[PDB]
Amino acid sequence: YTRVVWCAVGPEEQKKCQQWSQQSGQNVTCATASTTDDCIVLVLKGEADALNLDGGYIYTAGKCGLVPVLAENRKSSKHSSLDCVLRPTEGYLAVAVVKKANEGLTWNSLKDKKSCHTAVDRTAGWNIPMGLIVNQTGSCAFDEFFSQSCAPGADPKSRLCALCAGDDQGLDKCVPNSKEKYYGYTGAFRCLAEDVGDVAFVKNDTVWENTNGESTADWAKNLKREDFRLLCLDGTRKPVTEAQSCHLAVAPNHAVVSRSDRAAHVEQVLLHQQALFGKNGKNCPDKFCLFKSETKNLLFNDNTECLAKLGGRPTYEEYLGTEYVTAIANLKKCSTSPLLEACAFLTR
Ligand SMILES: *[C@@H]1O[C@H](CO)[C@@H](O)[C@H](O)[C@H]1NC(C)=O
Ligand SMILES: *[C@@H]1O[C@H](CO)[C@@H](O)[C@H](O)[C@H]1NC(C)=O
């Protein structure tokens, strides 16, 4: 009970957790498992107390009877808000943007249209819109929904890659990294800017960044924000400035999760742990850093500024929100989780 057992996924996280444990003087200790699903099970089973999960996993742990403890507060990825512990920063906005000059285009007029995605299986670029598209329709065949798309990471033979176009030489088509020209936020946005796609699924921050002189890239630079609208779920459209009222869903901050019975205590422990090892912590560079990893995002995301208070005791569905929940629930209906299945079994 006094200790808090963390669940690491992989040897790289395991190693980092071991150094944490050591430095914490054994108040934090570590269970390791091969998959995230396996950790949620350990926690469900009381053999581990906590770990930190992404949105899809919060949903799934949520359904199995786990709850969010502290939210991972971003910085912006560099830059500013404060103070970090008391207020959770909202979490970025997934938007669907289309050219203003195209007005015969709405959230309900997207079938057989052309789509530009950031990547397959990303939150803003894939998971939220396709999750919601299939809410709209009731089919799991979102793959057949757009006539053509650029969805980096999908099958290159398929319609979902038909719009990607690799790099200068056309090489590495539909690859899920920067080498694919319409990869990521910028690329998805360029895909719409050059009218290769009808709709681009990005975040609010994306059009601001590539319009009106934020970017100098030859494709971006003479771009105008005027020229782009946002597709809201009420079927209307609005300017890019109004993302807060015209988005698909919020992309959830990663969060620590726990048995409700243990939430108070793991919380209490981590607040002190980050005072020791967090961004201003007594001991960070000096002995150990909670939000730095020798590889990438081990245990927490590297751009995490602190763990922050919920205020308080939200369920998963109140943490994620109705749109995000509808989104993921739709995805998981279409491609099941063994764990979600397991959690619905009447033998647990
Ligand atoms: C949208 O993004 C821009 C750039 O990050 C920011 O200035 C603005 O506050 C954001 N708007 C909303 C509604 O979050
Ligand atoms: C889901 O579908 C209903 C009708 O099917 C719609 O009115 C509602 O806005 C949709 N919800 C989301 C979160 O997209």
Q: What is the DSSP string of 95-148?
A: EEEEETT--S--TTS-TT-EEEES-TT-IIIIIHHHHHHHHHH--S-GGGSSSE
Taking the domain 1-73+255-316, which CATH number applies?
3.40.190.10
Q: Which ligand is located closest to the Cα atom of residue 79?
A: 1
Q: What's the CA gap between 102 and 321, in Å, rounded?
A: 31
Residue 213, preceding peptide bond in cis (omega within 30° of 0):
no
Residues of the chain with CATH 3.40.190.10: 1-73+255-316, 74-254+317-324
Pocket test for ligand 1, best of 205, 214, 242 (most atoms within 8 A of CB): 205
- The residues near 148 (Cβ < 8 Å, ≥ 6 apart) are 114, 115, 159, 162, 163
**Which residues have any ligand 2 atom within 6 Å of their CB?**
132, 135-136, 233, 323, 326
C-alpha atoms less than 13 angstroms from C-alpha of 161 in its C-beta half-sphere: 17
CA proximity to 77, closest of 185, 177, 191, 225 = 185
Q: Which two tokens stand for residue 240?
A: 């890019």
Q: Which two tokens stand for residue 122?
A: 């990303």
Distance 130 CA to ligand 2 centre (A): 13
Burial label, 209 (beta-carbon count in 10 A; 0-12, 13-18, 19+): middle
Side chain identity, residue 331: L
Q: Which atom from ligand 2 is nearest to the alpha carbon of 138? A: 5
The experimental resolution of this structure, in angstroms, equals 2.4
Distance 238 CA to ligand 2 centre (A): 19
Taking the domain 74-254+317-324, which CATH number applies?
3.40.190.10
Paired with 51 in beta bridges are 257
Q: Token match 């107390």: residue?
A: 49
- The residues near 235 (Cβ < 8 Å, ≥ 6 apart) are 106, 107, 108
Q: Which two tokens stand for residue 341?
A: 């299945």
Residues that constitute the known binding site: 54, 92, 118, 122, 124-125, 185, 254
- The DSSP output letter for 269 is H
Query: With contact defined as beta carbons under 8 Å apart, do 115 and 96 qualify?
Result: no
This entry's atomic model was obtained through X-ray
Type and span of the H or E element at 206: helix 204-209
Q: What share of the chain is helix, strand, coil (3-state, %, to 5)?
A: 35, 20, 45
